[PDB]
Structure formats: structure tokens, C-alpha cells
Amino acid sequence: MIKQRTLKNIIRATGVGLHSGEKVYLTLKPAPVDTGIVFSRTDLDPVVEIPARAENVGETTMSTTLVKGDVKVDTVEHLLSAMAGLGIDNAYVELSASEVPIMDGSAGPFVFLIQSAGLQEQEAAKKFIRIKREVSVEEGDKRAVFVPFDGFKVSFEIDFDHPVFRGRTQQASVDFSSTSFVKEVSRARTFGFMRDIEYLRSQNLALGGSVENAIVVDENRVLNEDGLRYEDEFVKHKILDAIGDLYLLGNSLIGEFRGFKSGHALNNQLLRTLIADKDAWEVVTFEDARTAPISYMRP
Amino acid sequence: MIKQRTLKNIIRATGVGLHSGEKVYLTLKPAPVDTGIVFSRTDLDPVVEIPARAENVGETTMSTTLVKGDVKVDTVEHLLSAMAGLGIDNAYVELSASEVPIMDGSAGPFVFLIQSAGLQEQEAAKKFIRIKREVSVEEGDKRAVFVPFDGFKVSFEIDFDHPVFRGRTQQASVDFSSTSFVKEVSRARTFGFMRDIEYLRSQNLALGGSVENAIVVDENRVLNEDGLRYEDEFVKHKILDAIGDLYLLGNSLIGEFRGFKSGHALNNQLLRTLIADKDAWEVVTFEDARTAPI
Amino acid sequence: MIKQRTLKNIIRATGVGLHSGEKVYLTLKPAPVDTGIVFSRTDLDPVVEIPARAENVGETTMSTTLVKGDVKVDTVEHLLSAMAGLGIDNAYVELSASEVPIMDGSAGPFVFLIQSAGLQEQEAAKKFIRIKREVSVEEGDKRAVFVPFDGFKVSFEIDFDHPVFRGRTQQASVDFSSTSFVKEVSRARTFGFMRDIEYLRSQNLALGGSVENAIVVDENRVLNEDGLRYEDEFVKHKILDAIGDLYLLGNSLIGEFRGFKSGHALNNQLLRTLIADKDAWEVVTFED
Ligand SMILES: O=C(NO)[C@@H](Cc1ccc2ccccc2c1)NS(=O)(=O)c1ccc2ccccc2c1
Ligand SMILES: O=C(NO)[C@@H](Cc1ccc2ccccc2c1)NS(=O)(=O)c1ccc2ccccc2c1
Ligand SMILES: O=C(NO)[C@@H](Cc1ccc2ccccc2c1)NS(=O)(=O)c1ccc2ccccc2c1
Ligand SMILES: [Zn+2]
Ligand SMILES: [Zn+2]
Ligand SMILES: [Zn+2]
Ligand SMILES: [Zn+2]
Ligand SMILES: [Zn+2]
Ligand SMILES: [Zn+2]
Ligand SMILES: [Zn+2]
Structure with a gap:
């Protein structure tokens, strides 16, 4: 079991x-x-x-x-x-x-x-919640999709045309296990523009937010003295967010997620849409010597 | 005639x-x-x-x-x-x-x-439908205009700032007085992003769509093995689109079209706006072909 | 006095x-x-x-x-x-x-x-109108803010990703205790795309507009034969606009303005918000 x-x-x-x-x-x-x-x-x-x-x-x-x-x-x-x-x-x-x-x-x-x-x-x-058919949401140019997949796979793409982002990796896919999560995803930091931090810090918001807890960029460059943890850190963080937001389903997922410029709102909308379509998913367990198609760290 | x-x-x-x-x-x-x-x-x-x-x-x-x-x-x-x-x-x-x-x-x-x-x-x-005065429509940053012109001319400009488009020809004008539709426009393929094909296919839309019937790009490069047919193929396809959409007027146009990021929606809006403005156009015929635009 | x-x-x-x-x-x-x-x-x-x-x-x-x-x-x-x-x-x-x-x-x-x-x-x-508390407005991705400051300072940032704007100064600050409005700001010309001019002209608008009264650009380059008056002319003109729009308060400002893609509409909205927020400002005179 x-x-x-x-x-x-x-x-x-x-x-x-x-x-x-x-x-x-x-x-x-x-x-x-x-x-x-x-x-x-x-x-x-x-x-x-x-x-x-x-x-x-x-x-x-x-x-x-x-x-x-x-x-x-x-x-x-x-x-x-x-x-x-x-x-x-x-x-x-x-x-x-x-x-x-x-x-x-x-x-x-x-x-x-x-x-x-x-x-x-x-x-x-x-x-486990297994995705049985395709489900999707969109908000303007933003999209989030579930499709069936024997495992757990999370793909994401962003699209920034600012000089700081042009030529950087903005698409990634992870075939999910505990081991591929810890080393390839978990340490990806959130990110934003310094002008956005300045704006929050004016009006006394995000008081604990700084380069110490985010990749901070301006139009042309990364401002953190020590640079990026991964070359693909920006898009890996979106994958991290998606995994976290999707766990509000309350159980591990068996399926594939694909995001394009998706955020917490669209992630949550996708979850709601899935849950309400009972034909699009099923709860499954793996008993009597059967195994799941997802690998987790041994206790 | x-x-x-x-x-x-x-x-x-x-x-x-x-x-x-x-x-x-x-x-x-x-x-x-x-x-x-x-x-x-x-x-x-x-x-x-x-x-x-x-x-x-x-x-x-x-x-x-x-x-x-x-x-x-x-x-x-x-x-x-x-x-x-x-x-x-x-x-x-x-x-x-x-x-x-x-x-x-x-x-x-x-x-x-x-x-x-x-x-x-x-x-x-x-x-023929002859444009007598300027008519225009806009939607966000998109524009479509008819201008009086003694002939048929289609100008188009797109504006993509993705690396794959930076530096490529994104504006062109075709004056059909001197220029052939077949040679200069007809072979320009439609285009889009592979990520959009992926998405559309997942929705069981575009089930026939592939590199065999489109220029397919990603953020950084053209994906088709042999690249573009013409260097200006992107913007020429938009001109092709405009010519087709404008033919829903039902007659050949005597006038000039100018589009900036215009799509099928705005193209149709331009037509509907033109039709409603009865003093902005007239129907003409040519009893002597010599009096028509070249 | x-x-x-x-x-x-x-x-x-x-x-x-x-x-x-x-x-x-x-x-x-x-x-x-x-x-x-x-x-x-x-x-x-x-x-x-x-x-x-x-x-x-x-x-x-x-x-x-x-x-x-x-x-x-x-x-x-x-x-x-x-x-x-x-x-x-x-x-x-x-x-x-x-x-x-x-x-x-x-x-x-x-x-x-x-x-x-x-x-x-x-x-x-x-x-003078002195800014004593922070006041901000926003419209889409655009922002305008007043912050208390002992003097007058205007900071502005634009964000254009077209080739013609890449590799230019798109953010600038002017502290008018050190910087001269006349020599560093006043000559910055307005700017826009030739395609925008062409569109306005077809609507019988901007009939007096040309390279003679603007920096005109296309997607890739500046079209004026003479180039720019300042390297940072684009952002300096936005600062110029901010200063003009802010003078509609009716008196000189003691404080700092920060804009990000702010235009005349957001500038005015900031003024109206400031005026209404009576605890964020005071009128001051100087006896000496
Ligand atoms: O990763 C996140 N959520 O899962 C971030 C996204 C975010 C949003 C807005 C930002 C503005 C400026 C800088 C970085 C930003 C990141 N949301 S967040 O964790 O709530 C967050 C918000 C604001 C921050 C400012 C500065 C540092 C870290 C931040 C995190
Ligand atoms: O040229 C067209 N209409 O006149 C195309 C525009 C279009 C829209 C979305 C695309 C997404 C991805 C690739 C290419 C695309 C082109 N519209 S279309 O003829 O209906 C068309 C739509 C989608 C396609 C996907 C793949 C190949 C060809 C396509 C054509
Ligand atoms: O500086 C301004 N306001 O303070 C300009 C901004 C502007 C807006 C739209 C443009 C379109 C094309 C070219 C330049 C443009 C500048 N507004 S404006 O002073 O009213 C103005 C508007 C349009 C113009 C077209 C051509 C030259 C000068 C212009 C000034
Ligand atoms: Zn769907
Ligand atoms: Zn930018
Ligand atoms: Zn996050
Ligand atoms: Zn892009
Ligand atoms: Zn087409
Ligand atoms: Zn552009
Ligand atoms: Zn101005």
C-alpha cells in the first residue's frame, strides 16, 4: 500500500x-x-x-x-x-x-x-487525484491547463521582453518527484522589479521584502549581488508557485499542468473548475501491492 | 467595358x-x-x-x-x-x-x-467600391483606415518586441498599380507561436495545425527547418489577410487600406463603419477600361 | 520674506x-x-x-x-x-x-x-504646498506618487521595449536644488511614433504636428536628422510634463514626485487625490 x-x-x-x-x-x-x-x-x-x-x-x-x-x-x-x-x-x-x-x-x-x-x-x-480529461482557464493572454498524464508534470512559460529578460530561459518543464523537486525547483526565489518594491515601500507595504528574499531586477539587469541560483530561476519559481497553489486540492495530483503567464488567481480558478467537473477527475489509491506513478522521498 | x-x-x-x-x-x-x-x-x-x-x-x-x-x-x-x-x-x-x-x-x-x-x-x-473620404476604426492599440486613392494599395504594420521579431521587416506597402498579388503576396504563410499551437491542440482546436501550414516561432527563433519564404513573409501575410477580409465588401476596392496590428475583427469593423457612412464611398463602373486606375 | x-x-x-x-x-x-x-x-x-x-x-x-x-x-x-x-x-x-x-x-x-x-x-x-504624507494613485500599470521631501524633486521612469528605445536612459531624477530646470529639462521635446502622426493626420487631427515640433521615431530609429538635444531627452520630457501638470495645484511644491508611465490623466488624478487628502499637505510661507 x-x-x-x-x-x-x-x-x-x-x-x-x-x-x-x-x-x-x-x-x-x-x-x-x-x-x-x-x-x-x-x-x-x-x-x-x-x-x-x-x-x-x-x-x-x-x-x-x-x-x-x-x-x-x-x-x-x-x-x-x-x-x-x-x-x-x-x-x-x-x-x-x-x-x-x-x-x-x-x-x-x-x-x-x-x-x-x-x-x-x-x-x-x-x-491521489487523477486528471481524467482536459480542463483549462484563461484570463486575457494568461492560460492554465490540466491534461491527463501518468505521473506529475508541471510546465510553465513566461514572456518578458524587457532587456533584463530577453534571451534568458523563460520556459521549463519538470517531471515531478521528491528528488527533482528539491534540487531543481525548491530553491527558486520569487522575483520582481525594484520599482515595484519602491512603490510598496512607499505607502508602507511589503515591509519585510528586499533583495534578501527575492530576485530583484531593474529594466536592464539583476540587482542581487550574487546573481541567480539557477539560470532558469525565474520560470522555476512559477513552477514552484503552481505546485503550491495546486496542493490546495488537498491531495497529490496525477496529471500534467501547463501555465502561460499564470498566477495565483488563475491557478485557483483552474482548481475550482477542475473540482466542479466531476467527470474530469477521480480519487484513487494504490493498495494490495499496487504502486503510484509518482516517486516520493523515503522516510 | x-x-x-x-x-x-x-x-x-x-x-x-x-x-x-x-x-x-x-x-x-x-x-x-x-x-x-x-x-x-x-x-x-x-x-x-x-x-x-x-x-x-x-x-x-x-x-x-x-x-x-x-x-x-x-x-x-x-x-x-x-x-x-x-x-x-x-x-x-x-x-x-x-x-x-x-x-x-x-x-x-x-x-x-x-x-x-x-x-x-x-x-x-x-x-468597384471607390473610397471618397477617410474612414477609420480603432480597438486598443490597433487601427484600420480607408483612405481615398486612385488605385488599390494595402499597407500594414505589426509590432512584436519578442526577440524572434526584433529587427525583422514588420511594415510593408503594396501598390497594385505596378505590383502583382500572385508574386508578392499570395505565397505568404500564416504564422504563430508553438506555445499557442500546443494550447489550441489541447482544446481540440487547430487539430490540423502544424509547421506544414504555418510559420511557427518560439520566443527567440523561427522553428520551420527551411525558415521563411520571403524575408517579409510575416507582414505580407497580414496584407494577404487584409485583402481577403476587405473582399467581403463584395466588390474590388478603389482606395488605400492602412492597418496597424489590425485583425479580422477590426477589419470587419472598418467595413461595417464604411458601409454605414454613405458619403464615404460610391459604386463605380468603367465603360472604357482606359479610364480605370492602371 | x-x-x-x-x-x-x-x-x-x-x-x-x-x-x-x-x-x-x-x-x-x-x-x-x-x-x-x-x-x-x-x-x-x-x-x-x-x-x-x-x-x-x-x-x-x-x-x-x-x-x-x-x-x-x-x-x-x-x-x-x-x-x-x-x-x-x-x-x-x-x-x-x-x-x-x-x-x-x-x-x-x-x-x-x-x-x-x-x-x-x-x-x-x-x-508653497508642502507634502507631509505619502499619496499615491495608479491606473493599470501606471503609477504616480507624492512623497515628503525638503525641496522639489521629480523622478520619472518610462518602459518601452521597442528597439528604438532600448539602450537609452528610461529613468531620471531631477533635484532642483542642484539641477537647473532651464538647462537640464526645459528644452526636452515631446515625442511619438510616425505611425501615430500618420493616423492622427488621416483623422484630420494634429495638422500642425511634425519633426519641427517633436522627436519622431519609428520602431527602430529616431527619424529627425538632428538626433537628440539630450541623451535622456525622452524621460526628461516626461519630467517636463509632470512639472507643468503639477503646477495646476496653483502653487510651487515642496516635496517629491515619482512617476512610472504616468500621463496627464494620472498626474491630474494624483493632484485631485492630494487636494482631497487634507492631512497629507499644508500651505506654507517663508517670512525669511
Ligand atoms: O512569489 C510570489 N508569490 O507566490 C510573490 C510574487 C511577487 C509579487 C510582487 C512583487 C513585487 C516586488 C518584488 C517581488 C514581487 C514578487 N508574491 S509575494 O511572495 O507575496 C511577495 C510580494 C512582494 C515582495 C516584495 C519584495 C520581496 C519579496 C516579495 C514577495
Ligand atoms: O492567418 C490566420 N488567419 O487569417 C491565422 C492566424 C493565426 C492565429 C493563431 C495562431 C496560433 C498558432 C499558429 C498560427 C496561428 C495563426 N488564423 S487561422 O488560419 O485560423 C489559424 C489558426 C491557428 C493555426 C495553428 C497552426 C497552424 C495554422 C493555423 C491557422
Ligand atoms: O508632450 C505631449 N503632451 O504633453 C504630447 C504627447 C504626444 C502624444 C501623441 C503623439 C503622437 C505622435 C507624435 C507625438 C506625440 C506626442 N501631446 S501633444 O503635445 O498634444 C502632441 C500630440 C501629437 C503630436 C503629433 C506630432 C507632433 C507633436 C505632437 C504633440
Ligand atoms: Zn478547455
Ligand atoms: Zn521594458
Ligand atoms: Zn512565489
Ligand atoms: Zn516576448
Ligand atoms: Zn491569414
Ligand atoms: Zn515594438
Ligand atoms: Zn509634453
Whole structure:
């Protein structure tokens, strides 16, 4: 049987909130079978929990935001990408504030935290969502598509014609496993223009955001002193975001995603569209010695 | 006088439908005086005819689509460009499906079929639509203009800033006083991005679309093994498109067209706007061919 | 005390109207204290006056247009930039038509005409509007912002990815405590594509527009035989426009403006937003 997985131990970490600029306290905890990933606001009394599911998504402006009433948690997608990447089905993510710390702008830190906590296989079948037919959404020139595929494959293309981007890799495809996620995707940082940072920092927004947690460009060049982690870092980050946003489905996906200039809003719209078309997907498990077409890291 | 023209004989051909990926059966037939170009769906019972006229254009998303009720024929513009280019006034176009076959992505195959069918002059004056005053339309950054001109002239400019287009010819003008439609325009293939083909195919659209019927590019380079036919092939295909779309006026044009990033939608809008402005045009004939534009 | 300033003498000029292609007559005249800059349609009877104030701006399609009822004056910003740059508080600008003549497409001619008129210091304190809190507006990808600053600074960035604009300065800052408006900004000409000119002409518009009053480009190159007045002429002209548009506040600014692809419409929207946000600004005079 292909089994569900959680964390072996509790692990804690801290970092700055992108929005607040204040220190946020993060705790990852084990969770029972069929819990999924659940965020909890432990600064609140009573504590408020928000399951990481598509139906709980609120705003999708800059990051993916989860909401329950007036209570929110944003900046969820990078951590969720790491949970998806390492095959973590069940976990609690406790936070002292309304956002997951941005860390270095990638999913790398979260991969390392999960690894440090250790993996624990659980006595319950892992559920997968298999794409059975094509589903797509578009918003202007932006497109996001699911097609059937025996495995998990994520493709993405951006299109920037600014000098800084002309001739750089702007398309990539990853045939997904834990191992191809950790080394080829997880450390890809988010990115934006310095003029966009300037604009947010004026009007006192994104107070924790800097070159320390993003690739920062201007019209002509990359401004980070140490350059890029990967030549394809820009497009790899979009793949990272897509993996994280798609994990709001609540289970590992068996299929193929293709994005063109897609963002959190379109990713979420694609999920909603899939979920509502019951003919386009099925829940599957792999029992009695059968195996899944996706490879995950051994505990 | 300058006489109306039809085909001398029937001619048949086949080609894959861009949309369906299925073989489509095409027949070009002679037609009486004042018929214009009429498309006929022979797969339907009863047969449904749609005159190739500006008023009959439904959608314009990827190609020019003629519509009558729930029946449509799209990808009409490349064939219409050849009819316009060779001066065919009257003809029936019978089709087994909701699209004209895409052939090689240009008007070249239709030039052969029309010329092989032969030209037949008819005992009636050929009517022309002469532009008397400027008319224009815009949509976002896109523009389309008619300007008075003693002849027929089509100018077009595109504006792509992707590396694959930076530096390539993206503007051209053809004055048909001196210049041949067949030699200078007809063989220019349509074009687009491989990422768009991928997407369309995933939607079961463009099931017949490939490098065999388009110039296919990515962000940085032309993907076709043997590259372009002409250096200016991109912008010349836009001129081909304009000539075909403008022939939905129903008559040869005496005037100048100028497009900037104009597509089938804006082209049709220009026609509808022109038609509504009754003082911006007139119909003319030439009892002495010597008085016509060269 | 820092005093208000008007013109010393009346000065006249003529030029082609950008829209009409007709000869337009202009007169600059002194004005009393607290008049501000006032445009006058002196071709009409009775004469119609439109104060150059943010509340009187109508259309912002290609230029800034002032309106009172059905009477308009457009293309005001280049002249206004000159008035602002030379510290002219009070003046009348009389016109024979609904547009300020375009001249050479820059503020240079207006600087020279104002300079020719001479300066007259007046017996009243000059009022400044000081920015005390950040104010911002946005429209699509365009942004305009005021930030507190001890002086006057204009920062601007454009973003064109056409070959003709690549490899040029597309961002500039001017701190007017160190930089001279007259030598570093005022001569920057307006600019646009020849295809845009051709389109306007076919609509019987911009009949007076040409290489004689603009930098004209195509997709790949500058078409003017003479090149550029400054390497950064394009962005400097946007700064020039910003200065003109901002002078519709009615007084000189103490603060910093930052624009990204901001045009006349967004510039005006920023002014109207600032005016309404009373806690973000104050009027100040200087006794010494
Ligand atoms: O990767 C993201 N979401 O998954 C980023 C995308 C983003 C959006 C806007 C930006 C503006 C300027 C710079 C970088 C930017 C990236 N969204 S985010 O994680 O919420 C984020 C937003 C703003 C930031 C500013 C500066 C550093 C890091 C940031 C991250
Ligand atoms: O020339 C045309 N109409 O007159 C083409 C324009 C077009 C639009 C979208 C494309 C996407 C990718 C490649 C080429 C494309 C060309 N419209 S079309 O004749 O309907 C057409 C559409 C899509 C195609 C895909 C692939 C080959 C040929 C095509 C033709
Ligand atoms: O500087 C301006 N306003 O402050 C110009 C901006 C502009 C707009 C559109 C253009 C089209 C083509 C060429 C240049 C252009 C400049 N607006 S304007 O002063 O009203 C103006 C408009 C159109 C013109 C065409 C030709 C020359 C000069 C022009 C000035
Ligand atoms: Zn679909
Ligand atoms: Zn750019
Ligand atoms: Zn991200
Ligand atoms: Zn591009
Ligand atoms: Zn075409
Ligand atoms: Zn361009
Ligand atoms: Zn200007």
C-alpha cells in the first residue's frame, strides 16, 4: 500500500513577515490521517484553524490567501509547495501572525524544516487525484491547463521582453518527484522589479521584502549581488508557485499542468473548475501491492 | 467595358481542416452575374448558402467566420484573398465542413486552382467600391483606415518586441498599380507561436495545425527547418489577410487600406463603419477600361 | 520674506496650432497677487478666463485640457512647466484659439518668452504646498506618487521595449536644488511614433504636428536628422510634463514626485487625490 505521511517530530522556525516586517513564529506539527495541511493562528484566542483547501482561498493578489471569516493567513504557497514536494499529507502549521514568514523567497527553507522534522508513514492509504480529461482557464493572454498524464508534470512559460529578460530561459518543464523537486525547483526565489518594491515601500507595504528574499531586477539587469541560483530561476519559481497553489486540492495530483503567464488567481480558478467537473477527475489509491506513478522521498 | 468575371469550369480539391484535422472537400464553381462569392455547406440537408459579405461575419477570433443562424464557415479569408487578387467576381465555394481547408497556410494553392479552373468574362459591368473620404476604426492599440486613392494599395504594420521579431521587416506597402498579388503576396504563410499551437491542440482546436501550414516561432527563433519564404513573409501575410477580409465588401476596392496590428475583427469593423457612412464611398463602373486606375 | 512674482512687461508670440494647423496668437501679461496662472480665450466676446487649476482640467487624451462650460484651452502643460520652472506665480496667458501653440515641442520657447518679459517681485508672501504624507494613485500599470521631501524633486521612469528605445536612459531624477530646470529639462521635446502622426493626420487631427515640433521615431530609429538635444531627452520630457501638470495645484511644491508611465490623466488624478487628502499637505510661507 502507498501510505499517507506526516512529520515525525515537531519543528519550530522564525522569520520576518513580508507584509508586517515583524518577527513571525512558525511551528510544524504532526497530524492524524486525513487531516491534510491545516494552518492555525495561535496568536488568537480561541485559536483559529484554516484547512489548506481551495474553498478557503480568499485573495490571490500577490500571494495565495486562506480565509475563515475575518481571519486570514497569506503567503501560503511556498510552504505548501514543499509539503507537496516531499509528499506530506498531514500536518499542522501554527503561526503567530496572519502570514507565513517569507524566509528566502523560495521553498528551500521549508524543505529543510520538513527534512529536519523527519517523515512518518501512517497506516492509511494515500489518496491521489487523477486528471481524467482536459480542463483549462484563461484570463486575457494568461492560460492554465490540466491534461491527463501518468505521473506529475508541471510546465510553465513566461514572456518578458524587457532587456533584463530577453534571451534568458523563460520556459521549463519538470517531471515531478521528491528528488527533482528539491534540487531543481525548491530553491527558486520569487522575483520582481525594484520599482515595484519602491512603490510598496512607499505607502508602507511589503515591509519585510528586499533583495534578501527575492530576485530583484531593474529594466536592464539583476540587482542581487550574487546573481541567480539557477539560470532558469525565474520560470522555476512559477513552477514552484503552481505546485503550491495546486496542493490546495488537498491531495497529490496525477496529471500534467501547463501555465502561460499564470498566477495565483488563475491557478485557483483552474482548481475550482477542475473540482466542479466531476467527470474530469477521480480519487484513487494504490493498495494490495499496487504502486503510484509518482516517486516520493523515503522516510 | 471592364466586365465581371467568373470561373470557366468546376474544380475540386481537398485539404485538412485546421480545426477538425479531417479532410475537407472543396469545389469551386462558376456563378451568374451579380452572385458574388457564396459559400455552400453541402454536408447539410438542406444545403446552406452563405454569401461572403461583411454583414454575414460572426466571430473573428482566429479567422474570419461567415454565419447564417447556427451554420458557419470560417477560414474564408485566404481563399477570398486569391479571388480578390485574380479578379473573380462570381463563384460558388462548396464545402463538406465548417471551414475552408488551410492548405499550406497561404493563398498559393488557391491561385493555382482558380487559374486552372480558368477565367470567364461575363456580359455585365464589373462594379468597384471607390473610397471618397477617410474612414477609420480603432480597438486598443490597433487601427484600420480607408483612405481615398486612385488605385488599390494595402499597407500594414505589426509590432512584436519578442526577440524572434526584433529587427525583422514588420511594415510593408503594396501598390497594385505596378505590383502583382500572385508574386508578392499570395505565397505568404500564416504564422504563430508553438506555445499557442500546443494550447489550441489541447482544446481540440487547430487539430490540423502544424509547421506544414504555418510559420511557427518560439520566443527567440523561427522553428520551420527551411525558415521563411520571403524575408517579409510575416507582414505580407497580414496584407494577404487584409485583402481577403476587405473582399467581403463584395466588390474590388478603389482606395488605400492602412492597418496597424489590425485583425479580422477590426477589419470587419472598418467595413461595417464604411458601409454605414454613405458619403464615404460610391459604386463605380468603367465603360472604357482606359479610364480605370492602371 | 519670499515674495510672489509676476511678469514685468507684456510679451507676445505666435505659432501654429498643433490641432488646427492655423496661426495662433498669444499674449503674456502681468497679473495681481494671488491670481495664479490664468488662460484667457481672447478670441471670444466676452473673453473667457480659465484659471490653471486642477479642478478645471477636462480631457487628458494627448495633452492637459482646461475647461469652463463648453470653452476649452488645451496643450497648457509645456507653458505651465516654464511658469513653474521660473517661479512665476501670477500671469495671464491670452490666446486667439483653444490651444497654446506647440512651438518647438518643448518648454524652451516659453522660458525665453517669460525671460524676455522680465520678473517683477510683488508685495505678498509666496505660498508653497508642502507634502507631509505619502499619496499615491495608479491606473493599470501606471503609477504616480507624492512623497515628503525638503525641496522639489521629480523622478520619472518610462518602459518601452521597442528597439528604438532600448539602450537609452528610461529613468531620471531631477533635484532642483542642484539641477537647473532651464538647462537640464526645459528644452526636452515631446515625442511619438510616425505611425501615430500618420493616423492622427488621416483623422484630420494634429495638422500642425511634425519633426519641427517633436522627436519622431519609428520602431527602430529616431527619424529627425538632428538626433537628440539630450541623451535622456525622452524621460526628461516626461519630467517636463509632470512639472507643468503639477503646477495646476496653483502653487510651487515642496516635496517629491515619482512617476512610472504616468500621463496627464494620472498626474491630474494624483493632484485631485492630494487636494482631497487634507492631512497629507499644508500651505506654507517663508517670512525669511
Ligand atoms: O512569489 C510570489 N508569490 O507566490 C510573490 C510574487 C511577487 C509579487 C510582487 C512583487 C513585487 C516586488 C518584488 C517581488 C514581487 C514578487 N508574491 S509575494 O511572495 O507575496 C511577495 C510580494 C512582494 C515582495 C516584495 C519584495 C520581496 C519579496 C516579495 C514577495
Ligand atoms: O492567418 C490566420 N488567419 O487569417 C491565422 C492566424 C493565426 C492565429 C493563431 C495562431 C496560433 C498558432 C499558429 C498560427 C496561428 C495563426 N488564423 S487561422 O488560419 O485560423 C489559424 C489558426 C491557428 C493555426 C495553428 C497552426 C497552424 C495554422 C493555423 C491557422
Ligand atoms: O508632450 C505631449 N503632451 O504633453 C504630447 C504627447 C504626444 C502624444 C501623441 C503623439 C503622437 C505622435 C507624435 C507625438 C506625440 C506626442 N501631446 S501633444 O503635445 O498634444 C502632441 C500630440 C501629437 C503630436 C503629433 C506630432 C507632433 C507633436 C505632437 C504633440
Ligand atoms: Zn478547455
Ligand atoms: Zn521594458
Ligand atoms: Zn512565489
Ligand atoms: Zn516576448
Ligand atoms: Zn491569414
Ligand atoms: Zn515594438
Ligand atoms: Zn509634453
